[PDB]
RNA sequence: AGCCUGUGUACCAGGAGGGGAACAACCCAGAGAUAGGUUAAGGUCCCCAAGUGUGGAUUAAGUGUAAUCCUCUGAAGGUGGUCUCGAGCCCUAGACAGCCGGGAGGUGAGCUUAGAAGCAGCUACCCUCUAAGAAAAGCGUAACAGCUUACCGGCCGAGGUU
RNA sequence: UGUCCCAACGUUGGGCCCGGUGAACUGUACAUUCCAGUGCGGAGUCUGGAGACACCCAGGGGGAAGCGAAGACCCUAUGGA
RNA sequence: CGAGUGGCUUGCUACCUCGAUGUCGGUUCCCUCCAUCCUGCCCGUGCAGAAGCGGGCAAGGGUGAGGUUGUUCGCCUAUUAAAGGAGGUCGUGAGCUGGGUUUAGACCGUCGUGAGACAGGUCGGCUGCUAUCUACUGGGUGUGUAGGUGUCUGACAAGA
RNA sequence: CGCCACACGGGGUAAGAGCUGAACGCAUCUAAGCUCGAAACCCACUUGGAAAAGAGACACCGCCGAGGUCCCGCGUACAAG
């Protein structure tokens, strides 16, 4: 199913689990990657992926981008590299599909998405001055799998 | 192909039933296709003297019957024109079964053959008893 | 064959559309105009895109007909016709007291109308009516 | 911007309109240097390229005009030469100059001769398996050289195996 | 799946209307090469016979063998280049500048034109030569006419007039070459222009068939099978789709067929003679007997017997000339039979 | 969805006239008749009334010359096309690039191995001469050889680089 | 065996021209159109262009959402049989 | 996983038409589109050659004959350079066909107490009109340019 | 169903192969410039075409007579014309 069907915020917030059943499980495997036993403060560099437009990102997209991102950081820094990345958003918005003409159209439940306002940080990585260019590349791959354009913003890191 | 040396008015079409002028065991042949030919909308594919054709054995020995083979048209009832203007025509329509090298499959040819066909398929000719 | 023009304009190195606009204006005010050296008139832009446009006009047509001129002669005159209500009496009259020529059939030289001149030293992206016509397949009679 | 080029003593550089002519003991070359707002002129014993514009596009052509002129200076005195070697494997390649064009026969065993017309007053001298292309105008010379090599270009078969042809050996 | 198929008939010979001039008008001429010379001649179609020829083709497996070849016999008596017209180049193309006429005229040229009684040939020549000095001279052509009177089989006495270009060496040379002919009386022959074995383009107005339907005129199918018995036999399926809502001029329709000008390329001249060697016993059907200057053209020529045909050196020959073919036999057998 | 179904409001319906190419509801505008005048929306090269207006900048694609819209598309992604602005660092003690010259000894390090000598792998990665020159960055070799990078010097001369 | 390849020639009656006889269908108006667009989204008539000298003869029927019949299909009616 | 283009499939909507705009398939005849099957010219290759495989430009021309089936589609056969796809009221019934669909007769299976039904199968079963305008193919008469004969020019137009 | 005829060659390009060449000392097929290069584009070839409203050009004949119409015998033409 095309994301064109759900990328916009053109519907009420639909998140109440107490009134919704049959919600598919999320495809997001992890929200915290890298060395999650260490603190983000222990790193000199902090780079985030910022969404430039307000949108809805289906869990299937979060998983693809996050995966193709962390996958790179693993291939470039190792299955235990000294870095840590976080996907701070969770897909709370339940999505429908009307799958019988327009009669009794309320759709059946088919998925979940996370609402992201323009300017927000979707992902955030913390690395050493060395692996700074590797994380920037992981994000370049990630923003290629989500609807909006993004900014790869570098927070603590005046080692230009 | 090498120029025939005469003008031909194709006297046969796809589906025509003709005599198999040899001793392969095939008595009657049905024209299925004409080598190198391409027609036009609604036109029944045609073949005449000198053309190599794909054939199906209609009448003959059980072993030959129904086999799809290649052949060469050696005689036809419709006239052909020779360089000197004279028209030439035969008593019947006949072809000779031929292999992938154009060598006759049989050992002996039956009846006359047009000289022009002989020029084109020599090994076929070197089997003919009468060349007209 | 003799045209008592009150004005003789020289289109050499002049922007066709800008000249056309002034000749239409004058023709409507009663002036008899003769545009000379049409093959030398000029049109700015990429030669490749300009020619595509004129080639498309040559290819358009059907039984009713869309006869588009190929000679710089007619190209220029059609250009002027598009700035005149040629289907109205006054408009047809104006248009008919306007004539374009290949070269200069007069003894008097034409004048260069203000604002219509192109400076070759400051411009390289432009084409000549003659060039267009040649591409269109016209017979370079000029 | 403005650039001044002192013309060589052996040379004389005249120019009218957008055309510039350079003459020396080795011959003469004429060129049209036409670009928006770039004035080229011969101020006494120096050629001047100047413009009131200084954008990247203008600067590009200025530097381009200079090299063209310096090349003209070099060509009318020292001259331009390119060296070429005719290599072939199985079939003996016959390379000859006929009229104003260089002809090649039996290329790769072909019955039909391949040929190309020499540009300008370019001169083509062949000595055995060696060819030398020379003249005052680097444009015509460089092309003639290139044309000869292109003349034995092959697209059909693997070049790593079929290498017959004439190649530019030395570039001026 | 609706198989493809080329359209019925060519769109290059339209509109298919009745020709304006029964006398053919070449719309192109040979290139200038050899010495100056008239680039065309004319004659009247008589009929056909055949001849046996020795294969001429050096690339033919039959070179040097007997070959029967169909031939159309055309009576080509002498013509009269009666005037020299000059064209000047102008911004609007070529335009007639002046003409240099003669004094001697065939006794019946007055059945078509108002022959000149007072004319200044030198004033005309003067203006022309000045045009050449000025460099405004376009090609040079001769006003030519036939002498039907010399042809008994043809009833007409009224000459047929046509203009024929003169090409050749330098303009000055052919201009003088042109003036030379004209002055004499303009009398010239087929020999002066063509040699047996050369290729000529023949032009002529085809045989008229009046109104004919799409099948015959454009070669469209007749209705087939059951579709041939419902009331429609020789009518096309439809005049076009719902949209565009109009009939395109490209759909095959009824109309005039025949009597159109046609220019047939590369016709080999088998022989140019004089006398009655080609004549057929009993006489050419619907024509008569030949006994005078004649030309044998390989194959067919457009037009019915008696129609004026024109010759021109082929402007796009495919093969090189093989002069004076050897003719071993010319059938004189009756054409009735 | 030019969809369905609410809500508030103005409009069409039942609303002229001016503009918007045409165009119920988009803009100006609510209108007795007639007349003079000045504006509104919108527009001022010609078609067509009014500018080929002024100061300045950008664009080379005919981009564009398209308020709104079923009606005018243009996206994620990419761009040493070009213009403008800012920050860091390097530079006449000569920067950046190019070209020329040098790129050397202990020693082919030790190990592994029949052999490996910058460059299979493992480990170490030290000091002489010196203006430079790795226990060698990339090719190359069966292994050498050979070709270059680093590094230094010269020629050159003004901005260069991120 | 012309159903077909693939159409041809011929025969009789029409068709065409002439004398005489002499209807009907159809008709809001205007109307020489074509390409695009617009419009209740399927325009000869609105907009922009293009083309277009008037009239007449023969023709095969692309369009006039052609003419002929207040859709037979579908639904609706506190209709009928 | 993300972003789009098309309007060939299907679905959705009910805007136009119920004082009627006649269906599918086929046929015949004409024009077009390119997202190219062949043909031309190229680039790459896990390119020796021959040949494959993939890609680029390109719509001039071509893309055919047959067996089952009403079929479209598709399956199959022999040929072929190749036997591409799509738009034109799913072009084309005041052009054809009438096999299919889709009245009135009849049968079978299933359903129904029954009349009768079926988005199943099956046999039979009707196709009006003299063209007013416009459009085009060909043929004439006039006027305009503005006495006559003959010969031409070539703006434009058509072609594969 | 038979028989005849239906290019070669130019010019400009696409993809692509390159030359010279700078912005950016070098490099670079490109930014200016240039050499090539498709069955495709233009020309070449055939057909129509003075109603092309800028409504054309030339030559001769004639204005008391050039030419033309009717008429007559006919078809290389033709449904009327
Ligand atoms: Cl077949
Ligand atoms: Cl047209
Ligand atoms: Cl108007
Ligand atoms: Cl410019
Ligand atoms: Cl049919
Ligand atoms: Cl009010
Ligand atoms: Cl434009
Ligand atoms: K309806
Ligand atoms: Mg068929
Ligand atoms: Mg006979
Ligand atoms: Mg006989
Ligand atoms: Mg109301
Ligand atoms: Mg005005
Ligand atoms: Mg645009
Ligand atoms: Mg009703
Ligand atoms: Mg009912
Ligand atoms: Mg009841
Ligand atoms: Mg409705
Ligand atoms: Mg109807
Ligand atoms: Mg394409
Ligand atoms: Mg290969
Ligand atoms: Mg086409
Ligand atoms: Mg349909
Ligand atoms: Mg219809
Ligand atoms: Mg019907
Ligand atoms: Mg009817
Ligand atoms: Mg049945
Ligand atoms: Mg009953
Ligand atoms: Mg039935
Ligand atoms: Na312009
Ligand atoms: Na046109
Ligand atoms: Na009937
Ligand atoms: Na219809
Ligand atoms: Na109101
Ligand atoms: Na208005
Ligand atoms: Na534009
Ligand atoms: Na029959
Ligand atoms: Na009709
Ligand atoms: Na094509
Ligand atoms: Na089938
Ligand atoms: Na319909
Ligand atoms: Na149909
Ligand atoms: Na019907
Ligand atoms: Na039908
Ligand atoms: Na070319
Ligand atoms: Sr919504
Ligand atoms: Sr994105
Ligand atoms: Sr003005
Ligand atoms: Sr003529
Ligand atoms: Sr012509
Ligand atoms: Sr019938
Ligand atoms: Sr329509
Ligand atoms: Sr202005
Ligand atoms: Sr300004
Ligand atoms: Sr619309
Ligand atoms: Sr918009
Ligand atoms: Sr973008
Ligand atoms: Sr109008
Ligand atoms: Sr009729
Ligand atoms: Sr109706
Ligand atoms: Sr395309
Ligand atoms: Sr191909
Ligand atoms: Sr269908
Ligand atoms: Sr099926
Ligand atoms: Sr169709
Ligand atoms: Sr039926
Ligand atoms: Sr049923
Ligand atoms: Sr069925
Ligand atoms: Sr008038
Ligand atoms: Sr290129
Ligand atoms: Sr006239």
Coordinates of C-alpha atoms in Angstrom, one line a residue, chain E residues 80-275:
Chain E
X80 CA 11.7 22.4 -83.9
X81 CA 13.5 24.4 -81.2
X82 CA 11.7 27.6 -82.2
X83 CA 12.9 29.9 -79.5
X84 CA 15.3 30.5 -76.7
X85 CA 13.9 31.7 -73.4
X86 CA 16.0 33.1 -70.6
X87 CA 15.2 33.1 -66.9
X88 CA 16.5 35.6 -64.4
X89 CA 17.1 34.9 -60.7
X90 CA 15.0 36.9 -58.3
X91 CA 14.0 37.0 -54.6
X92 CA 10.9 35.2 -55.7
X93 CA 12.5 32.5 -57.7
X94 CA 13.1 32.2 -61.5
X95 CA 11.2 34.4 -63.9
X96 CA 11.0 34.6 -67.7
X97 CA 13.2 37.5 -68.8
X98 CA 13.0 37.4 -72.6
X99 CA 12.9 35.2 -75.7
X100 CA 14.9 35.0 -78.9
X101 CA 12.8 33.7 -81.8
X102 CA 13.4 32.7 -85.4
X103 CA 12.1 33.4 -88.9
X104 CA 11.5 30.0 -90.2
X105 CA 8.4 28.4 -88.9
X106 CA 6.7 25.1 -89.7
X107 CA 3.7 25.7 -92.0
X108 CA 1.2 24.8 -89.3
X109 CA 2.6 26.3 -86.1
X110 CA -0.1 28.9 -86.6
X111 CA -2.7 26.3 -85.5
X112 CA -1.6 26.9 -81.9
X113 CA 0.3 30.2 -81.6
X114 CA 0.1 33.6 -83.2
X115 CA 3.5 33.3 -84.9
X116 CA 5.8 36.4 -84.7
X117 CA 5.7 38.8 -87.7
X118 CA 7.9 41.4 -86.2
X119 CA 10.6 40.5 -83.6
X120 CA 14.1 41.7 -82.6
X121 CA 16.3 38.7 -82.0
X122 CA 19.4 40.8 -81.2
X123 CA 17.7 43.1 -78.8
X124 CA 16.5 40.0 -77.0
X125 CA 20.0 38.5 -77.1
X126 CA 21.5 41.7 -75.9
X127 CA 19.3 41.9 -72.8
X128 CA 20.1 38.2 -72.1
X129 CA 23.9 38.6 -72.3
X130 CA 23.7 41.7 -70.1
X131 CA 21.8 39.6 -67.6
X132 CA 24.7 37.2 -67.6
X133 CA 27.3 39.9 -67.1
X134 CA 25.2 41.1 -64.2
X135 CA 25.0 37.6 -62.8
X136 CA 21.2 37.4 -62.6
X137 CA 20.8 34.7 -65.3
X138 CA 18.8 31.6 -64.3
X139 CA 18.9 28.5 -66.5
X140 CA 18.3 28.6 -70.3
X141 CA 15.4 26.8 -72.1
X142 CA 14.2 26.3 -75.6
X143 CA 10.5 26.7 -76.7
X144 CA 10.0 23.4 -78.6
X145 CA 7.2 21.9 -80.7
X146 CA 6.4 18.7 -82.5
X147 CA 5.4 18.1 -86.1
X148 CA 2.3 15.8 -85.9
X149 CA 2.0 16.3 -89.6
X150 CA 5.1 14.0 -90.1
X151 CA 3.2 11.3 -88.3
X152 CA 0.4 9.8 -90.5
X153 CA -1.1 7.6 -87.8
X154 CA -1.7 10.7 -85.6
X155 CA -4.7 12.7 -86.9
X156 CA -3.6 16.1 -85.4
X157 CA -1.7 18.6 -87.4
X158 CA -1.7 21.2 -84.6
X159 CA 1.8 21.0 -83.0
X160 CA 2.3 20.3 -79.3
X161 CA 4.5 23.0 -77.7
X162 CA 6.7 22.4 -74.7
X163 CA 9.7 24.2 -73.1
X164 CA 12.9 22.1 -72.6
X165 CA 15.9 23.1 -70.6
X166 CA 19.4 23.3 -72.0
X167 CA 22.2 22.2 -69.8
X168 CA 25.9 21.5 -70.4
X169 CA 29.2 23.3 -70.0
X170 CA 29.5 26.9 -69.1
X171 CA 26.4 29.1 -69.4
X172 CA 28.2 31.3 -72.0
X173 CA 28.9 28.2 -74.0
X174 CA 25.4 26.7 -73.8
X175 CA 23.8 30.1 -74.3
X176 CA 25.7 30.2 -77.6
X177 CA 24.9 26.6 -78.2
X178 CA 21.2 27.4 -77.7
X179 CA 21.2 30.4 -80.0
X180 CA 22.9 28.2 -82.6
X181 CA 20.1 25.7 -82.7
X182 CA 17.2 28.2 -82.7
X183 CA 18.5 30.4 -85.5
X184 CA 18.8 27.5 -88.0
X185 CA 15.1 26.7 -87.8
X186 CA 15.5 24.8 -84.6
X187 CA 15.2 21.5 -86.3
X188 CA 16.8 18.7 -84.3
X189 CA 16.3 14.9 -83.8
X190 CA 16.2 12.1 -81.3
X191 CA 19.8 11.2 -82.3
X192 CA 21.1 14.7 -81.3
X193 CA 20.1 14.0 -77.8
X194 CA 19.9 10.3 -77.0
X195 CA 21.9 7.2 -77.9
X196 CA 20.5 3.6 -77.8
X197 CA 21.3 2.0 -74.5
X198 CA 21.0 5.2 -72.4
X199 CA 18.4 5.6 -69.7
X200 CA 15.6 8.0 -70.2
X201 CA 12.7 9.2 -68.0
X202 CA 9.4 9.1 -69.9
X203 CA 6.5 11.4 -68.9
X204 CA 3.0 11.2 -70.2
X205 CA -0.7 11.5 -69.4
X206 CA -2.1 8.1 -68.5
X207 CA -5.0 6.5 -70.1
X208 CA -8.4 7.9 -69.0
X209 CA -10.9 5.7 -67.2
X210 CA -13.4 8.3 -66.1
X211 CA -15.0 7.7 -62.8
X212 CA -14.0 4.5 -61.0
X213 CA -14.7 3.2 -57.5
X214 CA -12.4 2.7 -54.5
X215 CA -11.6 -0.9 -55.4
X216 CA -10.2 -0.1 -58.8
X217 CA -9.0 3.4 -58.1
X218 CA -7.3 2.7 -54.7
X219 CA -7.1 -1.0 -54.6
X220 CA -9.3 -1.6 -51.6
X221 CA -10.8 -5.1 -51.0
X222 CA -14.3 -6.0 -52.2
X223 CA -16.6 -7.0 -49.4
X224 CA -15.9 -10.7 -48.6
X225 CA -18.0 -13.8 -48.0
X226 CA -21.4 -13.0 -46.4
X227 CA -20.5 -9.3 -46.4
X228 CA -20.7 -9.4 -50.2
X229 CA -24.4 -10.4 -50.4
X230 CA -26.2 -8.0 -48.0
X231 CA -26.3 -5.1 -50.4
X232 CA -22.7 -3.8 -50.3
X233 CA -20.1 -5.3 -52.7
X234 CA -17.6 -2.6 -53.7
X235 CA -18.0 -0.1 -50.9
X236 CA -15.5 0.5 -48.1
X237 CA -16.3 -0.2 -44.5
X238 CA -16.6 3.3 -43.3
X239 CA -15.6 6.9 -43.9
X240 CA -13.8 7.3 -40.6
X241 CA -14.1 7.1 -36.8
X242 CA -16.8 8.9 -34.7
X243 CA -14.0 11.5 -34.0
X244 CA -12.7 13.4 -35.7
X245 CA -16.2 14.2 -36.9
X246 CA -15.3 14.7 -40.5
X247 CA -14.1 12.6 -43.5
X248 CA -10.4 12.8 -43.9
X249 CA -9.1 13.3 -47.5
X250 CA -7.0 10.2 -46.9
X251 CA -9.9 7.7 -47.0
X252 CA -10.2 5.9 -50.4
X253 CA -13.2 7.3 -52.3
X254 CA -14.6 7.2 -55.8
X255 CA -13.5 9.7 -58.5
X256 CA -11.5 10.4 -61.6
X257 CA -9.0 7.6 -62.4
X258 CA -6.6 7.9 -65.3
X259 CA -5.6 10.8 -67.4
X260 CA -3.0 11.9 -64.9
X261 CA 0.5 13.0 -65.6
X262 CA 3.2 10.4 -64.7
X263 CA 6.9 10.5 -64.9
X264 CA 8.4 7.1 -65.2
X265 CA 12.1 6.8 -64.3
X266 CA 14.9 4.8 -65.9
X267 CA 13.4 3.5 -69.2
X268 CA 16.2 2.0 -71.3
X269 CA 16.3 3.0 -74.9
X270 CA 16.8 -0.2 -76.9
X271 CA 17.1 1.4 -80.3
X272 CA 16.7 4.7 -82.2
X273 CA 16.1 4.1 -85.9
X274 CA 14.0 5.1 -88.9
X275 CA 11.9 3.2 -91.4

